[PDB]
Assembly symmetry: D2
Homo-oligomer: 495 residues x 4
Amino acid sequence: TLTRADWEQRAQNLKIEGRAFIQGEYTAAASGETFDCISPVDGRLLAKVASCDAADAQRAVESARSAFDSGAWSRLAPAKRKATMIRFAGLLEQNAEELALLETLDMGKPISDSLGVDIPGGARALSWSGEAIDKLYDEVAATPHDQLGLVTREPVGVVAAIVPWNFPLMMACWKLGPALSTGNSVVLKPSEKSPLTAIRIAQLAIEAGIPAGVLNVLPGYGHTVGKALALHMDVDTVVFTGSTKIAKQLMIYAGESNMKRVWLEAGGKSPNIVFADAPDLQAAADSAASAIAFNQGEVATAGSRLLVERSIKDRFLPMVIEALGTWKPGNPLDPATNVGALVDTQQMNTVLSYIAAGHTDGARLVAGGKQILQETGGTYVEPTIFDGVNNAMRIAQEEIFGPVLSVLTFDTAEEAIQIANDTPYGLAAAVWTANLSKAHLTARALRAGSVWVNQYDGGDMTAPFGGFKQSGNGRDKSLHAFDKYTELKSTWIKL
Amino acid sequence: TLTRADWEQRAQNLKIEGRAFIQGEYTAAASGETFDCISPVDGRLLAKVASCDAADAQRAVESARSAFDSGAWSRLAPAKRKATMIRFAGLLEQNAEELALLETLDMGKPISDSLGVDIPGGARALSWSGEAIDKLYDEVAATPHDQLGLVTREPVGVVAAIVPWNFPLMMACWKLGPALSTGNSVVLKPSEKSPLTAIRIAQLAIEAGIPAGVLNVLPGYGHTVGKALALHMDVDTVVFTGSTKIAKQLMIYAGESNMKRVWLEAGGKSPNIVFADAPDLQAAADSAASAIAFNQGEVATAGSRLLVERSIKDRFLPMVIEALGTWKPGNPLDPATNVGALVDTQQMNTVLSYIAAGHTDGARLVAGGKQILQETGGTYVEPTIFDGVNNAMRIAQEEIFGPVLSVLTFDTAEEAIQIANDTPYGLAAAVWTANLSKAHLTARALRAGSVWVNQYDGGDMTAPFGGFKQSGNGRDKSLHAFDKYTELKSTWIKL
Amino acid sequence: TLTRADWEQRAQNLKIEGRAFIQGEYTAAASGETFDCISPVDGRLLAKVASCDAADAQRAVESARSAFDSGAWSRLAPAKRKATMIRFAGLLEQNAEELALLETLDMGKPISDSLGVDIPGGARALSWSGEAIDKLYDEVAATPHDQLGLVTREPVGVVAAIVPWNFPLMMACWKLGPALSTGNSVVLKPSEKSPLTAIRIAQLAIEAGIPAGVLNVLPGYGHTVGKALALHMDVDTVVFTGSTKIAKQLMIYAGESNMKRVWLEAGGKSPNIVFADAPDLQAAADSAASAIAFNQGEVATAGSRLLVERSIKDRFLPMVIEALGTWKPGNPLDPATNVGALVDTQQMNTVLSYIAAGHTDGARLVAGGKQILQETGGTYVEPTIFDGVNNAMRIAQEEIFGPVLSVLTFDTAEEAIQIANDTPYGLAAAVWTANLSKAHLTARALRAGSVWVNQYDGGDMTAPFGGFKQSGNGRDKSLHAFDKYTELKSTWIKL
Amino acid sequence: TLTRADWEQRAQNLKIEGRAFIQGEYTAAASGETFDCISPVDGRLLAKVASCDAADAQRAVESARSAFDSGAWSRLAPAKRKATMIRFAGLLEQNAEELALLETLDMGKPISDSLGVDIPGGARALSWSGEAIDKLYDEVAATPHDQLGLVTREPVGVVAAIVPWNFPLMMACWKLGPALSTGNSVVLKPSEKSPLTAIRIAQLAIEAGIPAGVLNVLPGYGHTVGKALALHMDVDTVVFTGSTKIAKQLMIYAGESNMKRVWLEAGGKSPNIVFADAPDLQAAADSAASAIAFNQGEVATAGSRLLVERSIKDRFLPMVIEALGTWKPGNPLDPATNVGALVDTQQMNTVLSYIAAGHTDGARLVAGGKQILQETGGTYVEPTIFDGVNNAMRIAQEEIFGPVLSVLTFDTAEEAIQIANDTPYGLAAAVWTANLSKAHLTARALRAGSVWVNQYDGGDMTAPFGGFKQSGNGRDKSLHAFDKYTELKSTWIKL
Ligand SMILES: NC(=O)C1=CN([C@@H]2O[C@H](COP(=O)(O)OP(=O)(O)OC[C@H]3O[C@H](n4cnc5c(N)ncnc54)[C@H](O)[C@@H]3O)[C@H](O)[C@@H]2O)C=CC1
Ligand SMILES: O=C(O)Cc1c[nH]c2ccccc12
């Protein structure tokens, strides 16, 4: 296992690709323009990254359409797409240390998180979706003796995948795993905040046997190359993870253009509900802390509203505070670090503005509240807890996307449910109770795509993942993620 | 069987409800405004129908939300919803002769059509959907021993259904069936061109045991109450059948509103591909004629592009022409009538303007081509055929929505596919051939939601129905229709 | 509601068919032999029932094969079979009062039982099975592009169903429902102890539109016509509910015959596990009493082993005892009667001999324990409880098939499972506890086909039913029941 | 690629294990007895193989029961059983040349068949079933709001797998892949004719991470160790592939003992039906030859009745004869050989007795008929064709299990169907036609588990495989094979 010094040497010794990837080749943007990729770790210049626009989009869509029409991947045998997808995942694992290090330098998460959560997680999404292609079965209808009716699925065609920066490789693999498996071509627009891992893996896909043009990568700004894709006339489906504001704008784009399919995964204000009869109080405290502190609160499913029953609130809130103190911001290149940098100064000041709004709304600060380690030139905020929060307050309604917990109270399960669902979101939620009926009945009433019971951030590749309401449409991971990339056909045959 | 005279008297003795239906009662629009419901049969004024606006949408959606939250329907046991759903169908079949009379009078299709296709059709969508409720199963994932991972479906909440006028009852039941069966509340916006059946079955649902507020009906204009419903912020899902141009608009409204779910059934330019080696040319010719004549050619899955292998086109065309002669417009209240009125003056002049375009385009008119029965006080076009159409032509590329055939020819099976897929649409297509290989391979390359082989207008309630590309997203009929009215939840339980 | 007097007259005025049913007509056995059908209510002679033998099996199976091969049923469209199947159910509900009277008179269960459980129960198995026919889908495999791989189901052919006497109509419908719905032909051998309902619904099926020969009924003895059917070489599948000792025999016959398929529903010694922390002790006590009293304890899923946490056994037992007092044998033709006659003199002396064994075994009798109502001319045992039973005891290990409770105690949840799984059986079990973890983990370790939690006699038509180990193979009810009446075919088509 | 001399050197240099494997260790039979393993290639002594009996069975079942109860594999996480199963398959591929060579020396098939069909095929069955564990989902019922009903599958417990000698490693992997995946313990009784590969892989499983006792291997005679397993009281399910005679006797064993589950895969007389409109006549001829010649006719799905339409029979039968001549018996250690030895002299003389019976029945010999290469001390029979065969004849009814083709005629498809189904078997069948309707309609009418169209021996791991009628119960390969190793449980929970 590598020391801190070991990692800082590796970061020095990287040659970092910054070019786009189109038709099996790395390429500049047609303008030749670039944008600067700056690390949140120290502030250094990682690379000069190609800044793509509509022309670069049009080139990539033509490469996607061409490759798809050729059938070189979309009609390649399903046992062979399995093999190739599994090889693709293993090449992520082969160069895990390079890819993890790129992910830490690019958006600022702890190297030990990247090495042990992100890169394994993205490979997992690829290899699992690969294992599943030939385990899937389409349907025959019950038809009269002179009819045979097939209901089959086929690749939609060309998929645009616009992903965010909080889990750059993992989120993109969550889109690529199912989309690439079902035979589609994918044009992949990573975040401007985190272009480095999507850029590197394009060569890795080619080397695994993905045919040229089946996976092109277009780094650049959302309002440029991203808009262009969402607005393109030859793009069939767009998949997306990011701000509820942009997801909504994507829908408009689709209706303004070719009426493409739009699948969104937007934000969340996920309630974490601890009941007085929780089986292990310490586990819930540890989990409540981990729910807001992990990946410096830049998590869509962050447990950002802690919902406690009064009977235990006085005993519980110190337990949470003590757990949350084990989560200390640090040098993201240090393997012992578990809280990293916020992605950029912009993210840092939104977080600090919300903390202020916590005071202004009337809540009470009980831990954190400050930016630390500014001597580094990095951007870090200590995890922060607010108490006496009321669900109408700005820090209970609006997604903060930082390590900032709100704590509310309730007396009955009917109340807890009502407060948990008093949000435009529905991405995740948690229930802690040892009572069988209360456990299941509360899971039913929670309008959230993911409901964890006696644990937080649960699920593996078998669990679908996505939101209710303004939190998204569709589900990533699992067999259901495939449905966003396929189209049902009814072949009815007279005999 | 009832005679012409019989229906003429029955029509005269109908008493027609025109009101909207909210919270278990008939009602006016808040404004008190109405619009004249005019029958294309002879100008007869059927009734003065409520002209609802945004104020009424808000009343209805408030009603829906209360009903849904109360659980009277949404948490009523599956098997009980099933029985209710089947009774609902039963009441359609009980009032079949009135409902069919309303259909024919409001939008001008033949009464024998209405009695024999629409009412049984919409009834079955209600009953088959109810039959399947308790036959469904949600999933249990392969988890480690200390986990229980449930993957379940829940109703989204309140569903807005905006439905077209070509099949007023049945198109609505395609939505009501699954949407009501999954336990949602529905606000149903019928066509201003055809409100009568939707208005009517509202009472019928109450009587079947549907609770007040679970199904509310709002007659009125697309650009008033229809646009308000898709812009409403407490409407979780919108489902829509109709024009591609308006379907695009709903995607935009959703983006502008609450990021609600948007399922679209839109336009169509479906190809009918007849190979020389087709088993029965007579059968292919009668069905080619039926494919464009039935329901006045106002069918989204109409076979408006007839693609013929040149090697038989000199022989096949007269068989199509002669077959089409048996489809003759007449009194829609005559049981003998197989072609009815067009829906209004507006619709007739689109059809007539496109026939004019055909001559402009360079096409040869070989059958029909005129407006008929001007004496009636009603709107009628003869089934019309254009020969020598080139796929780039206007009457080939654009949907006409009347009895207008475009006849194209092809030298290879590959040419047949290029031409078939050379459209922004993908609702349906058909393939006539007795070759086992040619049939299935051609079916695969057709980017259409429904592919009929050696038949036209194939499938029953077990076959999904919907488009590729700009013809829509999602499927009506079958078990897949249920997906557009539910939301997936992953309940991961640590043990 | 009909009165005691009412049923007494109705019974007296019944005219009872006793004949067998082959090829659409009632008939005698070839021999002309009959056997006396004697009512356990008072010795009354209901009718002289056809005593069929191998000659009749061959006639019936010849009939079945012709019907099946003709296709009148086996290749009739799914949706048409569905309607027929539902009408069949309809005719059971139409003649519910006669059918129930027959059930109660033939095998001596309370008329309120028959009217309210058996007839609706068997009716629903017929209707729910018919409802699901067209809701099923067969599969399409992920193949290379030049292949089409269908995976479909077809009816096996002619099914022999030999059914027990504890639930004569419903147990038969559990087989008829799916077996008829998948389109097989059935030869149904009711119990010699209870032929009347099976004989009767044969007419009813003809009238529902079941073709002649598709359902044939052969009353008679297990060791004559029953053994012949399972030994017959044109019978593709045999399905059987009844004794473990006879179920073993059918496996042997199949080996000796045509290697036909053998699906078994057999014996039971199901455990009822009551933890101290159960939510409602009253609810657990009433249901423990119901679990052994209902239907005279002649239930395979009867809760004959009541496993109690010692920490509540001194408190819980009187609640079970007192509850059991409300179950009192009486006139089975009295609507007030909740415990009926035992099925015959033979059955009564097994129950009485096992009660004697209980005293021999070392158990303490705390309730009941006697034969009752000797004056009636009929066979009755009081619901009986033994306390201090050790799991090795005879009355613990062997099925008694009467109202006889054995009460055991346990110190740990692990002990509760050891004792529960310490039996050759695995039909059912239940677990009372309010702990979320204890409930689900205990449910997993119970090697039983049905596990009921915080309730007894759980499930509806959607839940599979059948044993682990020597209680059987395969499942009745749900969609899985259909698997025992179909055969899978892989049609791989090269293109 | 290895030469013939290269392989004969390797066969000299093998140390060959002949011991049983029980509880992670190789072990003698409790008697110390052995039997001689003699190669059909030259006649040499391969090893002295442990001859197991009931005591060795009892030891192995205790090891299986113990390992299963410990949960060390049956409750190990499904993603980890996937990993282990895939590692197990890769160790087959790592030592493919040793394992293929053992398979060729032990039962006499061509080394190039073993290396390229058998060993890849068995690894494929293991790795595929491994990939599929966490792609499988159990079910939640549609239940009232106060009920949650799970339908889950669990490992049956202890599985006995008795496999034949025609594909020793592949057939055993077809049982092991699904049985080991679902968590069961497997006791594996290979053929006495082919013990070597099952013996070797036991170490390979241990080395892949299969826990000790989860896979024990018991070589020895069917009437000894095999009978004992089938008769054992603590064996839950028996799976089997072999003679219809023994399969039937296994059923008797199960009923004589513990009423265990019995899954059988017995013989076949598979019709290969070539129609005059077959798309490629030469392909059908080549396939018809390959259908009987491949693996020297020792194939259950061997195309042993060629069904030809008269119109082409005179043109077709020479084409088959010419193809069949390219299939020449040879030294099984030669890589160019494609027909090997019959397994033993006993097999050789059954084949020769049937060839004689061909003449006696009245058929006419047109190719082969003789034993050749006796100078070798090996046992070889040249592929043989009989013409003018009638379905009543002994070589058209009785399975030969040699390279012996029967050829019959027909004039209509109704006739062909009738002759194809005029058999007690139903394992496979083939249809050759370019006509769409005839292709599908004939596949429907064929009572066979596998129906190939325009190809023979089709299917991959996605296609189930098993028989109708006396040809077996259940299906190997695909997701359905898992059902023989699991048990359904209905967990119904009141809330
Ligand atoms: N198409 C198919 O599925 C196959 C059919 N066969 C048929 O079987 C013969 C050749 O193969 P065999 O191995 O002799 O079939 P078989 O049924 O005699 O042998 C199958 C396996 O069980 C056997 N066995 C025999 N008696 C047993 C008993 N009393 N209890 C338990 N197991 C017992 C053997 O030990 C072997 O491991 C014929 O030549 C024939 O064609 C054989 C293999 C495959
Ligand atoms: O079971 C058999 O008799 C052999 C067999 C079935 N399917 C096969 C595919 C490839 C090679 C051999 C077989």
